[PDB]
């Protein structure tokens, strides 16, 4: 497999890695989503430690309204987070 | 750094190995975009052989009608692959 390829499972299996552990096998809930920032975005987002920061990033992330971050959602997540590493981080 | 961080250079990464090859460096064009599908896609989509397939590709990714897929337009094709394979490819 290409990098591309290799790429494209990594952000599968992280999703999965967080949101099997929890309810909704197939979501990240809020405390799931915070769990995967602080251990897999270490170095692209600073730590979130108030419950507040992590409202606002599902709240952001959440398009459907249900208050957890699905697979597509989780997608839009890392369009964001790839895009702001493509900028030098602003 | 985490997998998926590592996996968020990549994707900038493969972008920009095909993006600079042709005009304008920060797109590609159709010709860059077949070169990547064929050589970094070719486990996940069937290798383009006709113009035609990549024209057709080319009109799904250009949201913004310049004939060419610039790097947020990339985004969506990741999406869209990365969703491909996360539903076992249909
Ligand atoms: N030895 C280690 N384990 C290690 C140490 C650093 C590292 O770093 C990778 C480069 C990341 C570049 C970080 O760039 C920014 C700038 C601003 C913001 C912001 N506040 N939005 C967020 C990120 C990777 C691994
Ligand atoms: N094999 C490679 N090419 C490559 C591999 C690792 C790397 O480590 C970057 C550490 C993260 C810091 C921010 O990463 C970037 C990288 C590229 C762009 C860009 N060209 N837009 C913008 C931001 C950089 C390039
Ligand atoms: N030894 C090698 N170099 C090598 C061989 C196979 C391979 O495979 C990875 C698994 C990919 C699974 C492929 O699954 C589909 C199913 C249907 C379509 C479709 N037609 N849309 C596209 C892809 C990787 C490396
Ligand atoms: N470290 C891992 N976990 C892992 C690493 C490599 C791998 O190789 C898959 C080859 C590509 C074939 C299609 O890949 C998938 C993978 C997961 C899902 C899913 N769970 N939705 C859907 C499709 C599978 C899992
Ligand atoms: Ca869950
Ligand atoms: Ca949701
Ligand atoms: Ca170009
Ligand atoms: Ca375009």
Redesign the interface.
Known sequence: ??????????????FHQYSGREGDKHKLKKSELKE?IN??????LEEIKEQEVVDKVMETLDSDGDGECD??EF??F??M???A??EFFE
């Open positions: 497999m290409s990098e591309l390829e290799k790429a494209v499972v990594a952000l599968i299996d992280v995967l251990n897999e975005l270490s170095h692209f697979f597509q997608m839009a890392v369009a987070i790839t895009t590493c493509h």
